[PDB]
């Protein structure tokens, strides 16, 4: 699957050191399937792989 037209917003964030932030990302997928998710900065760790 390939995604386009992506946008990101963060309804809430707390730097609690316990996954205190949640990001909502809108996407247009070319087709059904699975995608890997990775942070491009060490500053932010994402729980979902």
């Amino acid at each position: 699957p390939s995604l386009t037209d992506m946008s990101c917003e963060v309804p809430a964030c707390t730097h609690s050191s316990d996954f205190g932030g949640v990001a909502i990302i809108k996407y247009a997928a070319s087709k059904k399937g699975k995608c890997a998710v990775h942070s491009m900065t060490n500053a932010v760790t994402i729980r979902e792989a």
Binding site: P11, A12, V22, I24
Partner: protein, 49 residues
């Protein structure tokens, strides 16, 4: 015979006066601070709203 008006009729701030026990009620004077401890279960997450 010479009692005059009672406090429920003369009191400032619209106070109501009653006895047994002696009470001043609903005097519209000053402020009343309130502190509420609200449990985590009472709150809905932003992302769930």
């Amino acid at each position: 015979k010479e009692r005059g008006a009672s406090l429920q009729h003369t009191a400032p701030f619209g106070c109501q006066i009653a006895t047994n026990p002696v009470r001043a009620m609903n005097c519209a004077v000053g402020n009343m601070p309130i502190s509420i401890d609200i449990p985590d279960a009472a709150f809905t997450r932003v992302v769930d709203a």
